[PDB]
Amino acid sequence: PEKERYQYVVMTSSKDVLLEQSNSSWPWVVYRMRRLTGEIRGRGPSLSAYPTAATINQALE
């Protein structure tokens, strides 16, 4: 149901469970400006610019 929709767990790297909960929301909000299909992480304008930046930095060096 809605009030149990988000399962939340805190544990250690050795699989020692410290906390288990079920709430209507989780702490995080994820932002994307643009997204290539099939990918979850986005791609923003600064990612489009870095090949140009690489050429400039090599020229200045």
Place this chain on the structure above:
Amino acid sequence: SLYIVYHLASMLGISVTNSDRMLARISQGMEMWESRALFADAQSSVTLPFRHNPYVDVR
């Protein structure tokens, strides 16, 4: 082959060619056939690109 013929004649002619003008002409034939041999060998295929292009490779 003709370039080697002239070049070898040029080396022998250092000691056995009578005239300096004649030796100069033999050396001229060596240089002429060197360029023509080089052109004939080179023109048969395309020119390969550089393997290192820093302003492109850095991307």
